[PDB]
Amino acid sequence: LVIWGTDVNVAACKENFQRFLQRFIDYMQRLGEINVIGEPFLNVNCEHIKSFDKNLYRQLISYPQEVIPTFDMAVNEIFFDRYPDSILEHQIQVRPFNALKTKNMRNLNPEDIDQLITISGMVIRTSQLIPEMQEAFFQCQVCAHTTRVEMDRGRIAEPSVCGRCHTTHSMALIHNRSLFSDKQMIKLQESPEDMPAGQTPHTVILFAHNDLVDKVQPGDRVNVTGIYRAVPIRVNPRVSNVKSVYKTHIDVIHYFSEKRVELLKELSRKPDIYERLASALAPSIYEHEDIKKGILLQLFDPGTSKSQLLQYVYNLVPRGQYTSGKGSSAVGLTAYVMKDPETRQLVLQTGALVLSDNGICCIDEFDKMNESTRSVLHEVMEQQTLSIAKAGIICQLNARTSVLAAANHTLLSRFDLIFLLLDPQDEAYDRRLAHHLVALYLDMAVLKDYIAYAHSTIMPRLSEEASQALIEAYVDMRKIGSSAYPRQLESLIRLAEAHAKVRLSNKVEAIDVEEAKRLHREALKQSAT
């Protein structure tokens, strides 16, 4: 009752499994989730046998279409005999989880026709549920009696068979097991890891048959290990000619360092840390370093080292979007929902500002925008969220992120921070330009880890002594030498959290106490006169 053409046993370790039971016992959460919860779709991890033996791993990726069913049938069959009183109606499919990251994701060769591969990117657009017919059966003429034959997988329900006897929709939908399946068109965008900007980035069509659709949230980071497939595209629907080009698509199947940190605290107590970090961090930035306060603290003539300053953010943190007006209308930034008239299917378009959560967006030339736009940002600035109200969708999209820029009636208070570039009219300052940049113009890994790993656990707390300090500050000094009365000052506590985020210090010392005080004087001058 088995064919030897593929030479696949049950796990290839049935004889090794008996001694595995008596030797390995002599990570509990993996075993216990199965027995107690009874959760389907077993979610086994990376193939760790590849560390032990490569041959066992190499045989589960060459023909994975013939391997996944083997794992599914074997695991279920054992439970059926051991546990006859379990739920056999809900099939369980063993799924690889965080499989091998295919080398040179950029260079996906066509040679690996049918193998698991791991793409890494983002989700651009998602399609509405597209039902499909699965396990189709035919209709006989002899008393309309159907015998179960197609139980074994491997048949293909080719189209154009139901252009006669359309009763199959009403009649054979349920009785011949022809219920519609689920599939979702998904377009990922490969992340070239700050490529030198050579070749264009490849698009991938992720739309496979598996019914796990939307149990993984779109609009996140992509770590979907999938199975490559190729299908012949018809040249014309009218004829049967097929061209010798196939569309790629990917199957949906998915569900020392700390020593360095301690060193930074020891050198932190030195009183020359301010000059050392400012000089070394972002050295490509020219004069007018008061602007750096927004950048340096928060991250860790127009375009006069200004637009370039934005380029640093785009270069430093790839998480974000850079855009500008005067070339895009209000609908050009988001809520661009549109359908394709050639294929007659709707697309629920989104926008970049929507995708801008957990980042900083680069928008400049804000004064040149029209009054029709700037509406969506206004809620974001005043409600920290982005609501999209169109006929299809009425809700709010999370905007738990910060965006800042700079400028050049008193209803301006909508802005978080306002700074004006003043001209000291000092020719000596420009002199440093030629020597600083023109004359001058492994470590990259170190700068990357600072944000992701260290900042993940750090959460400052405000002591009792450090709160009232700003409150008592503005009241007394405001009448000496002659708007502060709003609660705008209190909001400055948000940026105060940056002081503690330096040195990873949850405690407050003499450093960063007078630093917050002078910030009032810098804001006072630009609001004076």
């Binding site: 040679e111 070749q199 012949p232 097929v242 010798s244 080009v245 003539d301 380029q311």
Partner: protein, 623 residues
């Protein structure tokens, strides 16, 4: 005419027990190592240098040149028959193809005459063969490749203009039936094929079985495929024509080597395509070798005149002779003609961007001078600002007959790859296109917020802009917000701005009349005894000058700083419409950089630097 068996035996002996004089005239099994590597599946593509054959088998080379496809297939079969004798062990089953191949060989051995009962030769290859064009045949220009050379291995030069994404193409299609149990193979050569329906396998037709067949992609052979269009080098196209494009198809390991806009050398077989009065067909090129130029990266002594003769008085005086003067304006063109191809090996990527701006098109017919800029300068391509609409850079939907699904194309800017970019009629460009220019100004930061297009364009050429004035000559009486009509901030980004007013300068006005009178008098357009000379002589002398690569001294920059100081007083007091800033310092160092190339001394050079300052002062404040 000649027996193919004899030629196959000849090539087999040539590869196996025949010798060469590559390594000190000693045989070292040059191709033997590569054959061994093929046996172990460690090298995928095999190249046969025709030069090696031509060293000691001229007749074989001539026969190969006179017919390419047939000898290519013969060599492929010979290499296939050479493999089994170099087998040493069992294949470690690198991929699905190896597994299928070894099962197929096992099945063949198990059961061991109709000519249709064997594995096709292309299915069991796992190797690809290609030819490198022998140096004996000089490269041909695309226009000279006509129908008469069909089937002959030719080599042509050009520039890539449209490359599609890598996609898989199917060579052998595998069909399996539920009754026969065997494998049915349909080799596919045309770009379109017809799937099988009823198997013509003899077993089923004799048995009148169902013969239902299902196409599969498991055991099929796949090869890499690409489509590229290539256009002639502008330098050698006659002035009386425009370059033409010829289609090239590249397959296998040779793919992913050509990049858009790059000079490529292509060698392949010129073959026809069917699209299914008389029998009509198109043409393409199945490339076998793509080699880029190295230049794409990043006998007495009296024969030259470098240091003794000044370049200013000879080179400049023979540039743009049709122009009626503007010698000071002419000098800046030389700097533009030089550009920033020659840069120091210090990471100064900004040096090659020289975005010069010209305001006023009706002035002294300066629209004509663009063509001379393209023709004389090497590595320069003729471009037009008004050559297409705004759709030429983005993607749109138009009707097509030959080819093109989801068309992705660039404009004039991308067309000139690190060359000279010519843009005309700036004013007539729509508002959106103006932003497209402005995003180029920000050092290649082309961001598109449209759903289907998210490309990042690489603009590295030198941009020259000509702009018509605002429906008439500028009038002083008009104050700000009215006097200049093109956006001022847009002009600010440009490094150099030039505008010419046709003032009633009776001293200069007489000069124009004198030169137009000497027209129609004789055939010497430059009456000051300057001969046009051959373009060959000028280009050859210029090329060797690039190899010197002089470097300016950094210490001298301290002198320049004073110039910004005096400029500030003038900028504040004038309150004029034109305004400058620290960009001048940015410009000056770049501007001084090119001038010093004439005098390759670079120890003490003051006059060269000072002249660039004087050039700025001449144009501004002409009153």
């Amino acid at each position: 005419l000649k027996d193919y068996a004899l030629e196959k035996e000849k090539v087999k002996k040539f590869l196996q027990e025949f010798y060469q004089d590559d390594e000190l005239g000693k045989k070292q099994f040059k191709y033997g190592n590569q054959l061994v590597r093929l046996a172990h599946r460690e090298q995928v593509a095999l190249y046969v240098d025709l030069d090696d054959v031509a060293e000691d088998d001229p007749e074989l080379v001539d026969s190969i040149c006179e017919n390419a496809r047939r000898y290519a297939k013969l060599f492929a079969d010979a290499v296939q028959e050479l493999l089994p004798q170099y087998k040493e062990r069992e294949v470690v089953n690198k991929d699905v193809l190896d597994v299928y191949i070894e099962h197929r060989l096992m099945m063949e051995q198990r059961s061991r005459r109709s000519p249709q009962n064997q594995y096709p030769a292309e299915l069991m290859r796992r190797f690809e063969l290609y030819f490198q064009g022998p140096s004996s045949n000089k490269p041909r220009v695309i226009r000279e490749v006509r129908a008469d050379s069909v089937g002959k291995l030719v080599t042509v030069r050009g520039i890539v203009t449209r490359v599609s994404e890598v996609k898989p193409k199917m060579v052998v299609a595998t069909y399996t039936c539920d009754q026969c149990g065997a494998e049915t193979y349909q080799p596919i050569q045309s770009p379109t094929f017809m799937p099988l329906i009823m198997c013509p396998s003899q077993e089923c037709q004799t048995n009148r079985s169902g013969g239902r067949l299902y196409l599969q992609t498991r055991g099929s052979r796949f090869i890499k495929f690409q489509e590229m269009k290539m256009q002639e080098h502008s330098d050698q196209v006659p002035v009386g024509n425009i370059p033409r494009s010829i289609t090239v198809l590249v397959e296998g390991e040779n793919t992913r080597i050509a990049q858009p806009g790059d000079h490529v050398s292509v060698t392949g077989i010129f073959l026809p395509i069917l699209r299914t009065q008389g029998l009509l067909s198109e043409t393409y090129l199945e490339a076998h070798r793509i080699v880029k130029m190295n230049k794409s990266e990043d006998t007495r002594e009296e024969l030259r005149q470098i240091a003794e003769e000044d370049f200013y008085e000879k080179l400049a005086a023979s540039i743009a002779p049709e122009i009626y003067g503007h010698e000071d304006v002419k000098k800046a063109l030389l700097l533009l003609l030089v550009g920033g191809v020659d840069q120091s090996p210090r990471g100064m990527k900004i040096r090659g961007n020289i975005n010069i701006c010209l305001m006023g098109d009706p002035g002294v017919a300066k629209s004509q001078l663009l063509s001379y800029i393209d023709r004389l300068a090497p590595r320069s391509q003729y471009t037009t600002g008004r050559g297409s609409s705004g759709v030429g850079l983005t993607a749109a939907v138009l009707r097509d007959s030959v080819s093109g699904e989801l068309t992705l194309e660039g404009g004039a800017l991308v067309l000139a790859d690190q060359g000279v970019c010519c843009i005309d009629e700036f004013d007539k460009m729509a508002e959106a296109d103006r932003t497209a220019i402005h995003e180029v100004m920000e050092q290649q930061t082309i961001s598109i917020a449209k759903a289907g297009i998210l490309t990042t364009l690489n603009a590295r050429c030198s941009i020259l802009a000509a702009a018509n004035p605002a429906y008439g000559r500028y009038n002083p009486r008009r104050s700000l917000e009215q006097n200049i009509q093109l956006p001022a901030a847009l002009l600010s980004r440009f490094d150099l701005l030039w505008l010419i007013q046709d003032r009633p300068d009776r001293d200069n006005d007489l000069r124009l009349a004198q030169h137009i009178t000497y027209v129609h008098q004789h055939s010497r357009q430059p009456p000051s005894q300057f001969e046009p000379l051959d373009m060959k002589l000028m280009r050859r002398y210029i090329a060797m000058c690039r190899e010197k690569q002089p470097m300016v001294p950094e210490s001298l920059a301290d002198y320049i700083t004073a110039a910004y100081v005096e400029m500030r007083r003038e900028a504040w007091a004038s309150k004029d419409a034109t305004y400058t800033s620290a960009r001048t310092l940015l410009a000056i160092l770049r501007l001084s950089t090119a001038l010093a190339r004439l005098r390759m001394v670079d120890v003490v050079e003051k006059e060269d630097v000072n002249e660039a300052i004087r050039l700025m002062e001449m144009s501004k404040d002409s009153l």
